[PDB]
Design a protein around this ligand. Structure first.
Ligand SMILES: OC[C@H]1O[C@@H](O[C@H]2[C@H](O)[C@@H](O)[C@H](O[C@H]3[C@H](O)[C@@H](O)[C@H](O[C@H]4[C@H](O)[C@@H](O)[C@H](O)O[C@@H]4CO)O[C@@H]3CO)O[C@@H]2CO)[C@H](O)[C@@H](O)[C@@H]1O
Ligand SMILES: *[C@@H]1O[C@H](CO)[C@@H](O)[C@H](O)[C@H]1NC(C)=O
Ligand SMILES: [Cl-]
Ligand SMILES: [Cu+2]
Length: 235
């Protein structure tokens, strides 16, 4: 159970974005029905009033929280990967539009899942803004918690993979548009019962054996990281 508070741009806090520039759900309950419209931008997808100004090459940092900003972020039990996707805001998240900018599942070195490191990062994880066409975009951050993904939701609707999905309204101003955005995948649609990384038993199977759901990260993506980029306690 976790939600996005707001974003930082190049380490500068953009302020509380809930229902302002984040398309926030009314609470932190997971999405589990893979076929549901709720997989796009969670259960309350609608245009919110603001969209955060950024340029290509900027560092955009998502800040998640559990109950209060900068608390314990998400329960330790919720081991799993983190992905970020982009789509033209034009799409309202409909059709084959979602392009992956970032994937992080398990780090063999430190033996920590992305979710583990996000708690350590005080809810902060980033992507570098790609050189797409200037315009309006949704950035879709997705945490998959696997603490019950040994089952499928479609078979046993009180278990299943859990998706914490948050869409941010981002306006890209300056960009040489050196990497025009391609078509991508639908949500709902890209993930099915068969897709790798949806059904997995983190109780029995090594986390080195884990394979995150496709698609792969776009060649135009400029990477990203899970790590604190600024101190919410001084805001
Ligand atoms: O630990 C291994 C074990 O996990 C089992 O699943 C557990 C989770 O471990 C546990 O984190 C989870 O806790 C949930 C709880 O069910 C929710 O009711 C609660 O929701 C809160 C929310 O946290 C608040 O922010 C909000 O304000 O209020 C709501 C209450 O409506 O959120 C916590 C997590 O933060 O409970 C799971 C079981 O239900 C697996 O089932 C098991 O297989 C594993 O072995
Ligand atoms: C999942 O979502 C689809 C489409 O929204 C819906 O028809 C179906 O009833 C849902 N599944 C469950 C278990 O509710
Ligand atoms: Cl839970
Ligand atoms: Cu939870």
């Amino acid at each position: 159970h976790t939600l996005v508070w707001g974003v930082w741009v190049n380490g500068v806090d953009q302020g509380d974005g809930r229902n302002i520039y984040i398309r926030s759900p009314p609470n932190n309950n997971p999405v589990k029905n893979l076929t549901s419209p709720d997989m796009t931008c969670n259960v309350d997808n609608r245009v919110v009033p603001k969209s955060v100004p950024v340029n290509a090459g900027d560092t955009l940092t998502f800040e998640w929280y559990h109950n209060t900003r900068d608390d314990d972020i998400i329960a330790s039990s919720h081991h799993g990967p983190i992905a970020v996707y982009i789509a033209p805001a034009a799409s309202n998240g409909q059709g084959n539009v979602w392009v992956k900018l970032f994937e992080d599942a398990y780090n063999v070195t430190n033996s920590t899942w992305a979710v583990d490191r996000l708690i350590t990062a005080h809810g902060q994880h980033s992507v570098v803004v790609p050189h797409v066409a200037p315009g309006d975009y949704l950035f879709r951050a997705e945490i998959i918690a696997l603490h019950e993904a040994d089952s499928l939701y479609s078979q046993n609707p009180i278990r299943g993979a859990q998706f914490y999905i948050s869409c941010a309204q981002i306006t890209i101003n300056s960009s040489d548009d050196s990497t025009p955005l391609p078509a991508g995948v639908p949500f709902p649609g890209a993930y099915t019962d068969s897709t790798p990384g949806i059904q997995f038993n983190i109780y029995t199977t090594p986390a080195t054996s884990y394979v995150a759901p496709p698609p792969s990260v776009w060649s135009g993506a400029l990477g990203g990281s899970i790590a604190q980029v600024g101190d919410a306690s001084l805001e």
